[PDB]
Amino acid sequence: QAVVTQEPSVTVSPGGTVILTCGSSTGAVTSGHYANWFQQKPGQAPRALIFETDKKYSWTPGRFSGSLLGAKAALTISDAQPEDEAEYYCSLSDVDGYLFGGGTQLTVL
Amino acid sequence: AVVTQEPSVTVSPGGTVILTCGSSTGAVTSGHYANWFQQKPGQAPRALIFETDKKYSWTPGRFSGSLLGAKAALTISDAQPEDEAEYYCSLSDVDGYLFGGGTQLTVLS
Numbered sequence A: 001q002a003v004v005t006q007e008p009s010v011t012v013s014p015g016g017t018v019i020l021t022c023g024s025s026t027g028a029v030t031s032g033h034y035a036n037w038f039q040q041k042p043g044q045a046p047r048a049l050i051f052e053t054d055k056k057y058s059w060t061p062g063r064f065s066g067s068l069l070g071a072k073a074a075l076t077i078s079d080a081q082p083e084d085e086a087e088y089y090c091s092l093s094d095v096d097g098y099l100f101g102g103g104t105q106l107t108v109l
Numbered sequence B: 001a002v003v004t005q006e007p008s009v010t011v012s013p014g015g016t017v018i019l020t021c022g023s024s025t026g027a028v029t030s031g032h033y034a035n036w037f038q039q040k041p042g043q044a045p046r047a048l049i050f051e052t053d054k055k056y057s058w059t060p061g062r063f064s065g066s067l068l069g070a071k072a073a074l075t076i077s078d079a080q081p082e083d084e085a086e087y088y089c090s091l092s093d094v095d096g097y098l099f100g101g102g103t104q105l106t107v108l109s
């Protein structure tokens, strides 16, 4: 079974741009291997932000963008806001499993 | 709000069974993006359905998602022994992404 890897922690300046990444232990994340991103604040339900690696929901701020970066999936957060301070989880999905990473704590300073 | 699924259901081989996924606060609509997942003990769950009724390239034609009454529904037709598994649904909108408690499907031998 594959293991999904996310940075445990990242920091950004309000106004800044930060990149969060999501890797698979079994190889490069390519098309057909779907990444989903979720935002989670303490005491709140998580919210889905990205699906199929780069697609947004109607409630996803344009500041959030998904892509493939090298062999990994990436979530780019531009124009960081105080409200963006949260845990960000990625899942990688294909015929072999729908697998969660350990999450990235984003800190906005 | 809470997502509710039947604790357990049974189907005979070649039989048809329906599993449902309801919201404790209102009727499920297309705007809830119902997802379904299949999981066998000691195995990774696999995604089967997204956006209520959309399938992946690895989703068997036997599985279909719909809205049924005020709930999301997964219909499994011509059931196979390998369909025995725990089935999870998730409901998702701007207010959050929530999993149901899961339905144990038994396929009779």
Ligand SMILES: *[C@H]1O[C@H](CO)[C@@H](O)[C@H](O)[C@@H]1O
Pocket (backbone or CB within 6 Å): A002, A024, A025, A026, A027, A033, A094, A096, A097
């Ligand atoms: C690495 O390879 C495994 C299967 O060999 C997949 O589960 C994973 O998604 C990635 O392709």
